[PDB]
User: Fold XptA2 protein from Xenorhabdus nematophila.
Amino acid sequence: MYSTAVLLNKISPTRDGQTMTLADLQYLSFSELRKIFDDQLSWGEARHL
Amino acid sequence: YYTPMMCFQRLLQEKQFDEATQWINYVYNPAGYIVNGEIAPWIWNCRPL
Amino acid sequence: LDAAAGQSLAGQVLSIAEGVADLVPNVFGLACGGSRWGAALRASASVMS
Amino acid sequence: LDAAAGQSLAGQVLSIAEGVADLVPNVFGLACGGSRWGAALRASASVMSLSATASQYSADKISRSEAYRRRRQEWEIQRDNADGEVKQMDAQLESLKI
Amino acid sequence: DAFKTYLTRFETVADLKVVSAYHDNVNSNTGLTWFVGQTRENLPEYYWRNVDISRMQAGELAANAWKEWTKIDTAVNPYKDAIRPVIFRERLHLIWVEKEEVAKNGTDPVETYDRFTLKLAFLRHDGSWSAPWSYDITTQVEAVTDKKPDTERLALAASGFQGEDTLLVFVYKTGKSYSDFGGSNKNVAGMTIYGDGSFKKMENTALSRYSQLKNTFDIIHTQGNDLVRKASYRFAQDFEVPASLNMGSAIGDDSLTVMENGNIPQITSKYSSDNLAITLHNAAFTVRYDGSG
Amino acid sequence: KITVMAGSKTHTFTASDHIASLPANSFDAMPYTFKPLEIDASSLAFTNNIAPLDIVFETKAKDGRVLGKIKQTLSVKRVNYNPEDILFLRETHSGAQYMQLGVYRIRLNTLLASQLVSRANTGIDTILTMETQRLPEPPLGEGFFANFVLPKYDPAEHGDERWFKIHIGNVGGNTGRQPYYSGMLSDTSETSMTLFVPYAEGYYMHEGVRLGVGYQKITYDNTWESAFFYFDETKQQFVLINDADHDSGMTQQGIVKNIKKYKGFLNVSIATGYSAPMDFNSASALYYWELF
Amino acid sequence: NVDISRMQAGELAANAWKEWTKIDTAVNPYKDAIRPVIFRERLHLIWVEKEEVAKNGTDPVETYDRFTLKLAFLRHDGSWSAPWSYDITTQVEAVTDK
Amino acid sequence: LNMGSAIGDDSLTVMENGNIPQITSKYSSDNLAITLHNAAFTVRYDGSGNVIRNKQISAMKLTGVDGKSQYGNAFIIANTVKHYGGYSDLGGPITVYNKTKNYIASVQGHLMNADYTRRLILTPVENNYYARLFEFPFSPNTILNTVFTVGSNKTSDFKKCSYAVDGNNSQGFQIFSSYQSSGWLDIDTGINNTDIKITVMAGSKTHTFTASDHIASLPANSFDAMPYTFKPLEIDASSLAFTN
Amino acid sequence: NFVLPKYDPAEHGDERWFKIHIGNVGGNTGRQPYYSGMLSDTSETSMTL
Assistant:
């Protein structure tokens, strides 16, 4: 496989206006990030990120 | 069921603790279990019980 | 010393394979035979010893 | 002990050479064959046995050395106690003089 | 002197020359690559190691990506270099061949043909090796050696077909190229073994089904007597997928219900020219009322 | 419902049309099974021969509440048996084994124990020294060694970034670029390095073999900017092409007239007869770390 | 072995020599065909062996002598690696004039 | 064969990897011929490790307005340089003088004062700010150890003046860091094609091969490490005195 | 899969236990007890045979 930029863009923006970075999302363990972006990517990509 | 507590009991007999707790968590964990990045719905980490 | 005991604990497989593999006749042609009779029993003695 | 364990640690090469040397047929002419079947397996078994032997020797050697080390510590502590008592009763002695 | 003995052991472990490699994957991008090599001395003892090229950064490989050598204690005496590592039941197995000068009974001239013994054995959870299964392949090797094993270099390739948990091993004669399997090509005779010891020679069409694995053969390069060895690969028909999958359970929303036994037990893939078609059989789960406690 | 997404394809099968056996209706454990589902998947992006697909069990009630969303992902692996991309082991006549994967070469074994013997027949001191630590080793097959010196870092020319990717060009069947190396640039001096170009007979296609460099914000991969090389046979040696502007040159396909000096690199040359020093990062690195 | 560099033309001190050392290799050479050599700047020891063999498929079982050239080299511990073996029966037959 | 490396003279340079990897001997009737293939070594401008090295070589390696280079140029350096005074003795500014292109290149390891835009000051008195000779500004507030471009023929004046004053802002003196320089020393990093050479002596034969006639590949001409490789050398040596 | 009703003394009677029997098999057209169970007087009993 996956492109990190493509995935982060797929989740973009960061809800503040700009694209988020990996450092922006430290952020939360796997389950609640799968919840907060449930409709916006798949399980495998979540694992990847 | 038997071998995990075999190892656990021996560890406790040698004043080792943290590895013993890590070991016995294989059979029970009050904090529940983590599988596939998620909290388990079962209660005991051994099916027959 | 545990390593010594364990590597002792793994001679039985090879010794039994030796015993069973010796049964096949080794001479042939116009004078066949020559199988090491009772070899398997000595293999068993070796494994127990 | 060190020499014995080390030299027993060098029988494996010869034994495995024996194993690989026996596979060749020894009889020939009009009755060929006679190779010792499965001998190499017994060679491997023997090298395992002698390896375990040398390891036993090594463990005994080191255990014995550590036994001496402990005995040495014990001598040291009791000698220190002897000296402590010596100077202690020397102080007692100066008290008795005064 | 202790340093000297360690130096001796270091040189006998360091001069190791690798002789076979195998890849537990159907591509060249991920997986674990396994090497077996033989010592410089004239004694038959072998060492194995493996390395992860998933971490390969295209020309750069860190130290930790490797594994140290490891002795194989089995008493194998393989003929020349017909020794090879393979993986099935996702576990390691070693395969090799043995030459023995046997004479057929009831011949006035006692001719001395070469029986070829196919010996397979696997490493267990303590490195202890089970005794090898042995099969007779003298007929097939004679056929592919053209009754002259000695004049021509022999080799075998091992591959694991996990579509049905079988082993595809091919004995053949070295060449600059290789034609399709099955029928007129007499250079390659394969052998399929099931997970128990049942061996089967395959007929022409069954052979041709695996024709595409012909790329991983040990080919004499065009520069004369040059010999380049290729690592074997796990084979899939054209696209590998696990035959079953599952994700167990999950807590339902609002902590009032759960679902469980999410499983897809039968997964089949069929490749028709360009099309890849996935069929899932008896995919099922269950939904039951309970909370979180 | 079950939703399957693969590439641009999204098939939803509900119990309305793919139910195997509809269960009872109560508050009990309701088991749900489906007819064997067929899913067509050919539009997959097989990046590195692996294509990911996802399967979602969606369970919801008529009130609008969702009973739950099961997510699972599968990888589909494309069998790839091209001759060029299967690694194969080669041996030099000097006895240094290595493996080749496409363009890359990795040394596997080592050939140093002989010199350890030579020194250890004298005192131990001789073993554990720089000269033994920098013993030469034979080349990794046929090829050559090229020295590059790269300019001091400049935000104006190089730009945002200080690392750079040196890429290979004309090799095998891949005319396009392939990242061959990465480095970090020095903002206080010019960086010196030596790279081992591999070789095979007829391995290079048209116009020798290229050595290009990418700085971000810029890359000199246009015509006659990357360094160019070829194996000259009349000299039986590897020779560059574009050390300067020239009006005639002997490329792998003969006489060429439009020759310009290589760009980007401060300096490019061939380290003739140069032997790589004793490496501490090979497959056999751990033994060297242990021994030294 | 001995260093004759300190030879003073007929006279040498004892230290120029070195004490004897047993070779533990199980070598049984024919008569006196045994010899030391040095390469890789390390010792190697070479000898030949006589084996009474009969060529297969001969109505008279003649007993020629296969001559086995065995080379083994000393290691840093003094252990002897098992020898490489080569076949030189044809050349020895040619030079011995049968 | 190999000599490894050796320290250059004057504690400013070093010669590395002197090695002769390929020796071939050919015997033609009487003649003995030695051929050395890919004879090579390398040169690296670096000292034994002192103030002289870490300051003056960094002065060499950094450049200025002329555009990189300034290489092969004569410099007026100091023998020994020592703390003289100031607030705190950090790296401190010491300069070197290119005479061919009259450049003041001063280097400082680290700074302490971030308010005063202090001046590169070269004064012959160390005690009179009105007796100042050399004053030079900053483009960046922090110093990047920049060129200062003397301009005129002040080589001897540079030789006479000492006591590089760092602060010397409007307050008059404000000693930041001055360094004693003792005597002065001359260097020239220029080298000629004939300058570098290899000599082989055997018996009555003395063959000198320079880069003028037996050069394989001429390296860069800069302040970096120059690797030197020669053509395969033929050396005839037949009249040797074989003693023993 | 069998799901069996919640126990009722009116329709079941004295006993909450039940015997599942096999019929037409082999040569035994008669009854043959195949399984036994306890019925749940609070919920429905689910089992797979």
Q: What stands out?
A: The helical segments of chain A are 4-11, 30-36, 43-48.
